[PDB]
Design a protein around this ligand. Structure first.
Ligand code: HEM
Ligand SMILES: N#Cc1ccc([C@H]2CCCc3cncn32)cc1
Ligand SMILES: N#Cc1ccc([C@H]2CCCc3cncn32)cc1
Lengths: 462, 193
């Protein structure tokens, strides 16, 4: 009944002709499309010629469920050479995003309670809520300065600065000056470096270091120089907190990182590595989905009115207890999922398989890299009827996996959710969102999937 | 591929344009609506100066007023024209406002350098001045084209009862084609500084 691994359809391409296409173009922005049009033509599953190494691409929840069953105790995903290389060039420890095996598990189990635990979310929501409120207040001061009582702008910059403000408050208890004021040079450098870092990640991750060493030597220089400015933003943050908590321990709550520092169940070097991943990791992955949502709401007036109505409904109880936003706003929680179904920030899930397994009735040999492709998964018309239609209700009832699964699933998930959830909450209770730009926004791959264009949004205060 | 506004038109195209522009730009009735907006800004200017002035032991402030005056005219204009308040009185010049004063300057400069010979000489005698001239207008157009996109979208969604500037009245009446409204909207935005 079960078929040999080589019976599987092959991807048409080359690891070599794609090296060059990346070499030449300095990227791979259509990857998601190319992967999508390959599933169309070859079915739910195919192997890629890595030239000896085994990789499989899958698109079905059915197959995600099968993959989790084979999460060992130490679920592996592929070692991401350039990022790990920066850690070894500078002698820093690795964070949970880059660790595998026992070292992974040791870190993960000491990070869940304060980063992801719903107990934790209960402590940090009310802070997040403050930044979200400060954001709508700022917008509404400007809006009301205009005669038609509206502002039409690109929100991306201020959205990006929100996620920096909120993350930093959730994470360090530090309130930078960044909402309802101007980006700092430390902000724009950080955003710039993050973008450069992603860009170069693509240029380097598709060929071994032996090749890139001499194929793109200054692309490596670019990646490291980018990380340099990233690790300098983060270190500054941690040095601040480390020296505060050496002098006294607060009795109230003052952040995700503080809890870690106060408990000292991890070594300073371990805490350092993780805060870095949390500081760099909580910016672009939160801000794009959030942007994408504003846009789908802008282009679905009806879905927006439902959401606003349920946010005016919940309005008084939520300001009274921000910690309730999780349970009073299910329609909005759903919209998030709907946004991520369509615009999954992380394009792929991936597992280096510890055990033989069987997918779509093929033998899958041990040590095989299995990548799940979310763009296809959530656009699979057969599972999401009228997939091109933005419909939150879909989620009111393994089809939702944009944070991954099992022990490995995103450690910042509940922070990401809370930041998007609270911002939308406050925008909806104060503004109508509008655009004439009703045509789809072309997504684009540089390590994460992101809008290529930024639509012009109108915010009309009610 | 743009149309010309009134400043650049001759003949019947001009008259057709001008007569649809008087009522909302020039008339004593037009004035009666945009003057209180202009006044608010002018009040704002003095309010901002007085604040800076009273911080000094001598209750005075001595400066080059050219920068704030130029930003005054941009604010009052954008308001009157587009119903928008940019934050350019009693706050720093923005990089967009500065880039636009600069382009207008270059545009005028380079206008003088091209005006006085026919196109067929300037073509090969001063190619870099044409390249320069056009780039300024590009920058100029980008600015004014910003304002239009903003108000065009806003007006597609709610058509206000109260007065919100000159260009609103224009769009609302739709006596003029959108391209025509655009060209004239640009001329007023360039010309009002
Ligand atoms: C919409 C927002 C986000 C999405 C869609 C997302 C997605 C993901 C995905 C797909 C994974 C792969 C996990 C796996 O292979 O099972 C992951 C892991 C991870 N994410 Fe996120 N992420 C988001 C936001 C964040 C934020 C805000 C943080 C930091 C606060 C963060 C930090 C991490 C870390 C540290 C891991 C590695 C966890 C591990 O290996 O145990 N992410 N995320
Ligand atoms: N260091 C670091 C770091 C920076 C950005 C990320 C982002 C981008 C990669 C996918 C992802 C999942 N959760 C967060 N992320 C993750 C880690
Ligand atoms: N476009 C344009 C445009 C830019 C500047 C002007 C200015 C400068 C030229 C003389 C004049 C009379 N009235 C206004 N203007 C006029 C039009």
């Amino acid at each position: 009944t079960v078929l040999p691994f080589e019976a599987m359809p092959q991807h048409p391409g080359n690891r070599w002709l794609r090296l060059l296409q990346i070499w030449r173009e300095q990227g791979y922005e259509h990857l998601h499309l190319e992967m999508h049009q390959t599933f169309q033509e070859l079915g739910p599953i195919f192997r890629y010629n890595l030239g000896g190494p085994r990789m499989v691409c899958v698109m079905l929840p059915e197959d995600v469920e099968k993959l989790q069953q084979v999460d060992s105790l130490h679920p592996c995903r592929m070692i991401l050479e350039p990022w790990v290389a920066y850690r070894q060039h500078r002698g820093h420890k690795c964070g949970v995003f880059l660790l595998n095996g026992p070292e992974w598990r040791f870190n993960r189990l000491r990070l869940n309670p304060d980063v992801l635990s719903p107990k934790a979310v209960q402590r940090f929501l009310p802070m997040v809520d403050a930044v979200a409120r400060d954001f709508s207040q700022a917008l509404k001061k400007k809006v009301l300065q205009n005669a038609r009582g509206s502002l039409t702008l690109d929100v991306q910059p201020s959205i990006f600065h929100y996620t920096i403000e909120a993350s930093n408050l959730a994470l360090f208890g530090e309130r930078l000056g960044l909402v309802g004021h101007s980006p700092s040079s430390a902000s724009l450098n950080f955003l710039h470096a993050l973008e450069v870092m992603f860009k170069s990640t693509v240029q380097l991750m598709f060929m071994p270091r032996s090749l890139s060493r001499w194929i793109s030597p200054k692309v490596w220089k670019e990646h490291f120089e980018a990380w340099d400015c990233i690790f300098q933003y983060g270190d500054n943050c941690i040095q601040k907190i480390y020296q505060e908590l050496a002098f006294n321990r607060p009795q109230h709550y003052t952040g995700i990182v503080a809890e870690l520092l106060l408990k000292a169940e991890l070594s300073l070097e371990a805490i350092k590595a993780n805060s870095m991943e949390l500081t760099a990791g909580s910016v672009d992955t939160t801000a794009f989905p959030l942007l994408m949502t504003l846009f789908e709401l802008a282009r679905n007036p009806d879905v927006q009115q439902i959401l606003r109505q349920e946010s005016l409904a919940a309005a008084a109880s939520i300001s009274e207890h921000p910690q309730k936003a999780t349970t009073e706003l299910p329609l909005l929680r759903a919209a998030l999922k709907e946004t991520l179904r369509l615009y999954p920030v992380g394009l792929f899930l991936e597992r280096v398989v510890s055990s033989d397994l069987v997918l779509q009735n093929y033998h899958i040999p041990a040590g095989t890299l299995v990548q799940v492709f979310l763009y296809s998964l959530g656009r699979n018309a057969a599972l999401f009827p009228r997939p091109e239609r933005y419909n939150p209700q879909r989620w009111l009832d393994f089809h939702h996996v944009p944070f991954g699964f099992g022990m490995r699933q995103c450690l910042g998930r509940r922070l990401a959710e809370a930041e998007m959830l609270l911002l939308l909450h406050h925008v909806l209770k104060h503004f109508l969102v509008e655009t004439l730009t009703q045509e789809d926004i072309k997504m684009v791959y540089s390590f994460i999937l992101r809008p290529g264009t930024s639509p012009l949004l109108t915010f009309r205060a009610i």
